Amino acid sequence: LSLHRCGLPREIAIELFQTFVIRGLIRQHLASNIGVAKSQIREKKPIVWEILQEVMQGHPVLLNRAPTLHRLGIQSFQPILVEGRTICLHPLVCKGFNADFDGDQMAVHVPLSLEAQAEARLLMFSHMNLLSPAIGDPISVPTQDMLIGLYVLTSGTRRGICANRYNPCEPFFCNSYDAIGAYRQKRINLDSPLWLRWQLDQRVIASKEVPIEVHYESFGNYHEIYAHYLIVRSVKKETLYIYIRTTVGHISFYREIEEAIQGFSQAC
Amino acid sequence: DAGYLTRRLVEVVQHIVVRRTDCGTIRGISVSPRNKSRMMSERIFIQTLIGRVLADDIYIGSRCVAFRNQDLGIGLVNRFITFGTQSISIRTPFTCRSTSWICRLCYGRSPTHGDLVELGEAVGIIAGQSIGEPG
Amino acid sequence: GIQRDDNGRRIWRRRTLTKKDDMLRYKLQRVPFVEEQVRKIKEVGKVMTMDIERLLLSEDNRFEFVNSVAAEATEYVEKNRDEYGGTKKAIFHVLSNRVNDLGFDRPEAYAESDPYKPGPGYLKEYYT
């Protein structure tokens, strides 16, 4: 589900939106009067569901769990028709409802007037209620399974004695897409170290430390070796190359957030 | 017990709504970083001051660094801590000229909307729910 | 600063950056694999969320914004009752018009359908 969507059973949806389904039936001349439309609705005719799916578009609903302890205990979502008899709920809004999927139930409400629908759409939707009024902390933060996935993804290389049996007395990728493609072809693991060519400014969070070792050549070029990146500089030129020592997991996390931002920008 | 406590908490402030932009008060609660009885923890000095509206001008030498009726950002607070600013006067719910409503400046920035609180906001019920919820 | 090169044409100095801005090379780059992401954003209707946030950047009070949108939608429904309630929703039409009034092109009332429906009678079964 999207963060602004919920799933409604066919029975609950047809009960809640019954008058709108009657209007949809009569409007396109498929029902002679109100009684005929209601009889058609009772018969579960296949055209009742097309009209229901049409009239549910753009009409929000209000979900509510039982112990409403704060205002995020009731939120507004865009309903969609799902199979079965259960309400489909987004995982990131469970903390606001204090809901887990071990027997909990929710109530659904339909705003009728245009003022109520406008209020539900412009004030109560989840994408505009990302902060909790108590202290201002985010309420829709990844938890549990998503948090474990992110922690495993961004847990870097094994280092030191956990990487080599003996005291030591890695592929280079032009761009992150090459590294991810090599990972897809099982060439490298999720946490195997690699060097990534960096063509942006230095923006890698690392300990504020001087280089471990500087390899100065008599021709002018010198290599500065840090704990997590390599920087090539010269005295004759103004060139400056940067290589970041990382894994596919950090690349994947950074690319996920970057692509989310860029795709949202391009979609508008 | 918490359910009973929450109902009484919402009850006492249910009528408090932001109804004015500025009540016109001149009083301001004084906040001091340095106290000779204890070395103040800067963390507490920050989170309480963020979002408050200054009740008086702040000066460093002959230069004004923060004006009256100005939201206290985190940059200003650090500047106050960086220099020797011993007195900060802020507008709080204790300084409003009413106990039946509150104004935008005496409340401060919205708890969720980032900017200053908006007129017609039922901040009393939000205050009651915020305390009783974790009970 | 006036100078004519003997033929009636006026020669003037063009203004140039004449300096290095490292933010130019590092920032004008495009991600190549967001086609499905953009399509899904358009399908689910997050562009309308962005539009709603954009409209509120120019509103001092959001409750007044909601009231004005509701009043405009009510006027829309009263003037042309039969055009709304189905594929076109009045509030969505108001939002699209307010976005379009700024000069930003949007589909009317954010009304979209599925071109891949296999004829009449077939309803998409959502995959929860």
């Binding site: 003022e115 209020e119 004030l123 | 709504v17 109804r19 007129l119 017609g120 039922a122 | 409750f63």
Partner: peptide
């Protein structure tokens, strides 16, 4: 919230021509 602050001359006189 949303409830705060209470929410014919020139005709029949043309040129004969």
């Amino acid at each position: 919230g949303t409830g705060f602050n209470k929410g014919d001359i020139l005709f029949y006189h043309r040129e004969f021509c």
